[PDB]
């Protein structure tokens, strides 16, 4: 009975927290020296590119309301809170001859002191997609080996700054979904690849996220670890891969291979120091290659990972293109039954044991020996005839947390060691390409009312179940 | 050549203005002691009757943002700025017994203030739509014949606190329409008669509002004007109504009934003391009657009449009770597949700039009305969330737009027409009452991405080069 | 001796407060966003209803001095404080849809704050007589199932606000006082049944209290408690009721019946699921029936009661519909032209201090409760604006009353009740409801000439001497 799962069903060190990313939630785009990202640009220049032709201008104004925020973490009672910071607010140049923006700074400091004071545990991200358009312009962003240079020295200001406090750091946050959509599908910033190439740029660019990571991580490990006792990793983009057919060697296959391009593609290289055989033979000589110095500091480069978990799919066998090197095709149904219903977007199918699997087959393929949810939610059904009180009766999230941290439990029972779990997300707010329709929060934003908050009945079960 | 229409064209004082509604663009909705409206209220409960599901709560914050109004308004260079005061501000529970609200009177003195600083005058609506909610769950608001002296009460408090500046009040603003899409097809607030009988209440309504408006109007001639010497009048919604076969006689009268049960329902009243002709046959017991008292209070009820113009549509005669089937006529957008003129980005709004030199000319003709003003006349944007600001910006529709309806205005002059001034619909774009903020009038683009950022389009830089001072 | 009764004489955690209630200390009725009550309208539209006239629009300005209110709790040195919340100044239209009100949220908050900074615990009611008005204009308010939702949003919307801090919550205060004076002798606000009917409102009014408070404790315990770890109960309205001749098996049975119709009436409800016997005999069919559910939900729906006393009265049996007449007793003030007690300022007041004993010893025999707070008593100051503040302020009267009372109590838990903690009403002189500022419940006496200056009785200073720490 998942109905029933509690912090009681959990070791007492347990964390439970939820999520936002800059972009997504803080507005003040233009507000106290922020520089702008590449999300600024793709949602101004290409709002064609954007449901509703929306951007994070203002957003949920998370910016100027982060004491609202806090407030409402500490009403909700879980014991931590992971964000990430805008590179472009504390760099608005993104190097450091762009200058340092001390009122950006300021702003991550309140935040983390206010969360602190109300004894809330700061997981903090360095990147999450919003690439400072000084450096997209100057030399391509993540296409170019100069952002591993340029994202250490950001990370190392980071750490001198808020790390006496931060003692969880990610350097990344799906590096998989940055490179596919930024560089094979050009769904998101910076919207090459749909001038662009999908079979060569997102190699590089996840070449180039890897070392960045690398480079962070090297760099936190070696100059400020011991002076500040914390820890560093990374989080991952993940989705079930079930063999369509479960007798066929080729789908089971085919579902590992899915697995490979996806997850493998950044967890091989932080485990033996190179990418899948599976890539390296599919993708040749269109995959780079790492020297020997840089394997050696990719290899065991994390304290933890986190795994960000929403769906699954099952697999089969199937110009060069990132997607047609997988070599799969993707199936939703079984003789017309659906691996899962879907939620309100027809691409999340709601499928609990998908958790389960992806924790167990993280741990036995890469012996990762700490691990984290850093992402899982859904996202609530279309309907702006609603009023907030029939609005915030999400029993569909409500059903969907309470089965996957049933799965999460599972996954410990079966030897994975998971120290946290950290629902997406705290907030309604800017889901990229589908704007502001997609509300993933447990808690409600009133998009006609100044971004008022309102917790959803997930919020309440949530702060009740797993307070201490 | 109406794209060289200009100043030079008009009488030295001649006035030229732009337009807003408290409740289309204020937000604050619950901010400053401010009580809720009928709209809130609509919105709120019965998002379902809103594209989008949206509403009034914050609109483009003119409420917070109205120094940046004043500026853009400066800047515009226009003479004067038509605005409304929501009533539900200033009297949070509509009656004096729910309170005055100082802050809310601070805010409308404040605004007034800006505008005589920077050489604007203000034309003030009384009533735009925002009824009370407090009046209209006591007992029904223009339902019930208690709202004249509620709406008496609130007219002194505003000539009382703004009459030493405000010298051009209007009563109401669309009655027709507050009746019509309220209480006939239920898709404005308070959303009834789609619980509600489109058949009777439209006449109670409006035979209310008048009532209201008279009431007003006599207030004011006899308690304020010797101290004040402002004027007051009241706008009317029309729409030109052609016949759509030019020589059936049966076609000519059916326009001139769709134009007695849109325009002289509210007219006739003000002219003679009575309603048309055509609605005592067609409306008949369902239609009520005034008093001699209340005739004599009505008859010659203004100092001058404002009219509010967008459209057009030929007219033909029609082929239980509701007030659209009294009014016994067919509306036909085309003639031999030819539309009376081209959509703007509303499938509703037919461009026919000749509509508003006839439906002027007819206003003069029929109820011989001294003084006139257009109180709004104007466009929307076709719809189209993929522009940039620069290309969003260039609303060569509107512009066309407004020269052409200027030109007809100017055409009304020479035919003999007193118009007094012309006010643009509207200054920002705003809360299109059932069509959300996707239905864009403003001459000013609103980005509504980025807390509602002001920015001229081509049509409001034309204004103030072509009518500036 | 009752003049020594002391803190040494009580259990060492036994909780000693004072209390106060929205509408009748906070003023501020229009600011900060707050929407009005049912009292906010019956006190402005209905006057003569007030002693002289008055209203809670400012009453003693809590909302602006409440700094200096936690200052004076600080200063009297008591362990708790007893307040209520008003509905409509966190949600001004009462349901979600009217919008929440931040700045009332955070009035609160600085309040719950100010008190914890000072060791003074809180106790809270949701519901002290203040329903918003939306709610009342659009479906009734209690006359209306629909008010139990309206409820339940309203209570989670506290618990989630304020519940990580305030740890004992009261869904209602005196529901009979509300139920009585509000729908059968139109007293009180709404001012209906003296267009009403006190044969049959009184109990739907009831019905539906008994149904948001029972909806609301679970509420409570399914969604909050185990996180936040508070109780949360209810208080009632009660009088002692003493059969006029001791050795009269009619008066015996008239006295237990007056006992149901009061206290009974919400009680055996919250017991055992159903009204009392007496009540479905003599209300027959017009008293409305439970559901099995609803009976479910009721029975034990409670961490803890509180009482309220005052007064007490002979009774004996009685000589279309109405609940007073339903009843079927008489009250008598008088044996043998000995009243029961002297009379306090108020004529209805009669001093009795054996009745809280009594009514403790009642309570728990027939309901069998485990936790009981007593969460008024207290008794009003001889009206007399002769007298200057250090007269004024010697409330020999009070500070007896108080002694009486705490000592009867104290008997009460040696009979075996299971007496948690005792809070005098009131903390402030304030707005006594129909008879407006001229009775005086305060252990604080307020000058009303003088922007409502707080300075402390006798009683108050006893309070702290006696029971402080």
Same mark, same amino acid.
């Given at each position: 009975?998942?109905?029933?799962?509690?912090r009681?069903?959990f070791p007492?060190?347990?964390?439970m927290?939820?999520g936002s990313s800059?972009?997504?939630i803080?507005?003040?785009?233009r507000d106290?020296?922020?520089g702008?990202?590449?999300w600024?640009?793709?949602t101004?220049?290409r709002?064609?590119?954007?449901?509703?032709g929306?951007?994070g201008d203002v #957003?949920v104004d998370?910016? $100027?309301?982060?004491?609202?925020d806090?407030?409402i973490?500490?009403?909700?009672?879980?014991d931590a809170y992971?964000?990430?910071?805008?590179?472009?607010?504390?760099?608005?140049?993104?190097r450091?001859?762009?200058?340092?923006?001390?009122?950006?700074?300021?702003?991550?400091n309140?935040?983390?002191d206010?969360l602190?004071?109300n004894?809330?545990?700061?997981?903090?991200t360095?990147?999450?997609?919003?690439?400072?358009?000084?450096?997209?312009?100057?030399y391509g962003?993540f296409?170019? +080996?100069?952002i591993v240079?340029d @994202?250490?020295e950001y990370?190392?200001?980071?750490?001198?700054?808020?790390?006496?406090r931060?003692?969880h750091? !990610?350097?990344?946050?799906?590096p998989?979904?940055?490179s596919?959509h930024?560089?094979?599908t050009?769904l998101?910033?910076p919207?090459?690849g749909?001038?662009?190439?999908?079979?060569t740029?997102?190699?590089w660019?996840?070449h $180039?996220?890897?070392? #960045? $990571?690398?480079? %962070?991580?090297?760099?936190?490990?070696?100059?400020? =670890?011991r002076?500040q006792?914390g820890?560093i990793?990374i989080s991952? #983009?993940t989705?079930? !891969?079930?063999?369509?057919?479960?007798?066929?060697a080729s789908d089971?296959?085919?579902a %590992?291979?899915?697995?490979?391009?996806?997850?493998?593609?950044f967890?091989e290289?932080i485990?033996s120091?190179?990418? +899948?055989?599976?890539?390296?033979?599919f993708?040749?000589?269109?995959?780079?290659?790492?020297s020997?110095? =840089?394997?050696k500091?990719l290899?065991?480069?994390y304290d @933890?990972v986190?795994?960000?978990?929403?769906?699954?799919s099952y697999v089969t066998?199937?110009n060069?293109s990132?997607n047609?090197?997988?070599?799969?095709t993707?199936?939703?149904?079984?003789?017309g039954?659906?691996?899962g219903?879907?939620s309100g977007?027809?691409?999340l199918?709601?499928? +609990?044991?998908?958790?389960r699997k992806?924790?167990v087959y &993280?741990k036995? &393929? *890469?012996?990762?020996p700490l691990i984290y949810?850093?992402?899982?939610?859904?996202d609530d059904v279309?309907?702006?005839?609603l009023?907030?009180?029939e609005?915030?009766?999400?029993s569909?999230?409500?059903? *969907?947390l =309470?089965? /996957?941290i049933?799965?999460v439990r599972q996954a !410990?029972?079966?030897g994975?060691?998971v120290?946290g779990y950290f %629902?997406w997300?705290?907030?309604?707010?800017?889901?990229?390409?589908?704007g502001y329709?997609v509300?993933?929060?447990?808690?409600?934003?009133?998009?006609?009312?100044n971004?008022?908050?309102?917790?959803?009945?997930?919020?309440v079960w949530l !702060?009740?179940?797993? /307070?201490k």
């Open positions: 009975d998942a109905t029933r799962i509690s009681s069903d007492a060190d347990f964390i927290g939820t800059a972009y997504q803080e507005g003040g785009a106290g020296g922020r702008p990202s590449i600024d640009t793709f101004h220049r709002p064609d590119m954007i449901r509703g929306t951007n #957003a998370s910016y $100027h309301l982060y004491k609202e806090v407030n973490l500490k009403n909700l009672g879980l992971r964000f990430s910071i805008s590179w472009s607010r504390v760099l608005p140049g993104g450091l001859s762009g200058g340092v923006n001390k009122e950006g700074i300021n702003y991550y309140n935040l983390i206010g602190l004071a004894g809330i545990k700061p997981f903090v360095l990147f999450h997609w919003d690439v400072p358009q000084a450096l997209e312009d100057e962003g296409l170019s +080996p100069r240079d @994202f250490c990370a190392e200001l980071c750490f001198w700054e808020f790390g006496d931060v003692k750091w !990610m350097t990344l946050n799906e998989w979904t940055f596919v930024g560089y094979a050009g998101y910033a919207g090459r749909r001038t662009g190439n999908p079979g740029e997102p190699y660019v996840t $180039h996220l890897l070392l #960045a $990571h690398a480079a %962070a991580v090297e760099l936190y490990k070696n100059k400020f =670890q002076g006792e820890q990793g991952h #983009a989705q079930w !891969m079930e063999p369509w057919d479960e007798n066929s089971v296959e085919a %590992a291979r899915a697995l490979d391009f996806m997850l493998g593609w967890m290289p485990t120091g190179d990418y +899948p055989k599976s890539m390296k033979k993708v040749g000589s269109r995959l780079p290659k790492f020997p110095e =840089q394997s500091m290899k065991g480069s @933890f986190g795994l960000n978990y929403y769906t699954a066998n199937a060069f990132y047609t090197d997988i070599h799969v993707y199936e939703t149904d079984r003789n039954v659906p691996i219903p879907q977007s027809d691409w199918l709601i499928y +609990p044991e998908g958790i992806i924790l &993280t036995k &393929t *890469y012996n990762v949810v850093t992402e899982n939610g859904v279309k309907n702006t005839n009023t907030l009180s609005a915030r009766k999400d569909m999230r409500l059903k *969907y =309470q089965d /996957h049933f799965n !410990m029972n079966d994975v060691n120290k %629902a997300s705290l907030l309604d707010n800017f889901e990229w390409g589908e329709g509300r993933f929060g447990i808690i409600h934003i009133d998009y006609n009312d971004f008022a908050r309102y917790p959803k009945d997930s919020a !702060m009740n179940s797993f /307070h």
